[PDB]
Design a protein around this nucleic acid. Structure first.
Lengths: 100, 154, 50, 50, 98
DNA sequence: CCCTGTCTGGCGTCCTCTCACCCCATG
DNA sequence: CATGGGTGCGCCAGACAGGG
């Protein structure tokens, strides 16, 4: 669609996989069933200083070439015409037209 | 005080050299001038007189002492260097080495057709004592189960 | 010997174009080194220069 | 190459190289084991003479 | 107890792969229980083809999947030895679970 | 330092034709 | 089975001590 939206995902994949791909205890487990004193509330206070773009909620699985937001499929990581773009020129193994 | 010395024998007849040395001691009855004999090198607890030096070199199948000179041959680097060498040999037979494979870790195979090959342990089974590691054989990863001793930790 | 005074991988195969035993007994893939045997795949006078 | 009988009549250089490699393996093992000074001096001296 | 699983798509290329690994094991180990297959596996996906309209053009494609299991009977130190870094089938995923 | 004695090395003809025999030794 | 350590040649010549 646009190079700028494809420029969003390279920034998106970077800072998210700085914290929210490996460091998961500080973002998930630290507010589980423990005492309701404000120290685990102090844990999510540190969660504000990080970029909110770095959350995995930001994850938009995009077309790697042209960046199309809607009509996606995860089994190829592609847009809905790219799976035909390899179906009709054979760039994907086993991808046969279902003649059922 | 009896200090240690190193004797060279014909390598292979070493136990017979040790027995003949004990027997020459109990023949020429310089019993107060020899402590032990440890086992191609023979370790001797000894003192240094020229008589005892001629005694040890008159023991058959013995070349001579090994030291700085042949006038006054040399005790050892450490006080119990002979005992240290014996302990190192014993530790060498034990050969304790890093040999295992855990989840997300490269390992080494040295047994079976997969010997001389490396791989990673995708799954581990401490209860079954088996590591799930695949070997890059002809490109395709060959997930095979190897024991901790069958493979070494990389 | 596997890796001795008279090795296979370090020098070459005794037989001409034969790798070692069960591998390459024709004239197609001259060079492949099977894990079955660390060995070169060349002629018979190749060891004289190596 | 062997003789008529079959026992291999070995060359002299194989004795020389096999001696140097036997002594070099012994010297690597003694420097692994941290033998004392006079042992590795005799070992390196035997390698020098070999 | 020793399993040789083979994982690919088509049965028209794995069919020479089950021939190469039972016979080369026969010359060296001769200890195998025979190929026991697995149900054929289907991944069908209907996808829209018109560039910006018309939710009717859905063409069915499928990445087909097949699995075949060899299962040699005895841990042979000759079958594995000769067939370690050896697999005729190209573009295939071999799983020699020992 | 300038001559004198010693100590080790380097070397000694070319072609052929048979023969005989090539590391013990052993716990 | 596999490894592990004689005493009859004579000249030249230069390097190494050895006086000198």
């Amino acid at each position: 669609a646009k190079q700028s939206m494809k420029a969003r995902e390279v920034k998106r994949v970077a800072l998210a996989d700085k914290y929210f791909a490996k460091r998961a205890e500080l973002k998930a487990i630290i507010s589980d069933v423990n005492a309701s004193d404000e120290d685990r509330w102090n844990a999510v206070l540190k969660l504000q200083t990080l970029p909110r773009d770095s959350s995995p909620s930001r994850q938009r699985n995009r077309c790697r070439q042209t960046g199309r937001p809607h009509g996606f499929l995860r089994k190829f990581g592609l847009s809905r015409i790219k799976v035909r773009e390899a179906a009709m020129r054979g760039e994907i193994p086993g991808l046969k037209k279902a003649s059922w | 005080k009896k200090r240690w010395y190193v004797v060279q024998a014909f390598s292979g007849f070493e136990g017979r050299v040790a027995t003949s040395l004990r027997e020459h001691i109990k023949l020429h009855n310089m019993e107060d001038l020899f402590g032990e004999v440890m086992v191609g090198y023979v370790l001797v607890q000894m003192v240094m007189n020229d008589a005892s030096w001629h005694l040890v070199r008159s023991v058959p199948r013995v070349m001579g002492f090994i030291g700085g000179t042949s006038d006054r041959p040399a005790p050892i680097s450490d006080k119990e260097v002979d005992a240290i060498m014996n302990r190192l040999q014993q530790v060498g037979d034990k050969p304790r080495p890093k040999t295992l494979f855990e989840p997300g870790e490269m390992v080494r195979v040295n047994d079976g057709p997969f010997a001389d090959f490396n791989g990673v342990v995708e799954e581990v089974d401490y209860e079954k004592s088996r590591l799930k590691v695949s070997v890059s054989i002809f490109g395709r990863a060959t997930p095979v189960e190897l024991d901790f001793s069958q493979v070494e930790k990389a | 010997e596997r890796d001795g005074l008279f090795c296979a991988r370090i020098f070459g195969p005794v037989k001409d174009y034969e790798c070692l035993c069960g591998k390459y007994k024709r004239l197609k893939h001259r060079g492949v080194i099977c894990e079955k045997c660390g060995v070169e795949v060349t002629q018979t006078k190749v060891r004289r220069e190596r | 190459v062997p003789l008529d009988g079959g026992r291999f009549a070995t060359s002299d250089l194989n004795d020389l190289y096999r001696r140097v490699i036997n002594r070099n393996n012994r010297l690597k093992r003694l420097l692994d084991l941290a033998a004392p000074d006079i042992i590795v001096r005799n070992e390196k001296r035997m390698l020098q003479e070999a | 107890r020793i399993r040789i699983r083979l994982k690919a798509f088509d049965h028209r290329l794995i069919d020479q792969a089950t021939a190469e690994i039972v016979e080369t094991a026969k010359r060296t180990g001769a200890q195998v229980r025979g190929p026991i297959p697995l149900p054929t596996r289907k991944e069908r996906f209907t996808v829209l083809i018109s560039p910006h309209v018309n939710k009717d053009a859905r063409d069915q494609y499928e990445i087909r999947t097949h699995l075949r299991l060899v299962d040699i009977v005895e841990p042979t130190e000759k079958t594995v030895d000769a067939l370690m870094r050896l697999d005729l089938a190209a573009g295939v995923d071999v799983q020699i679970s020992l």
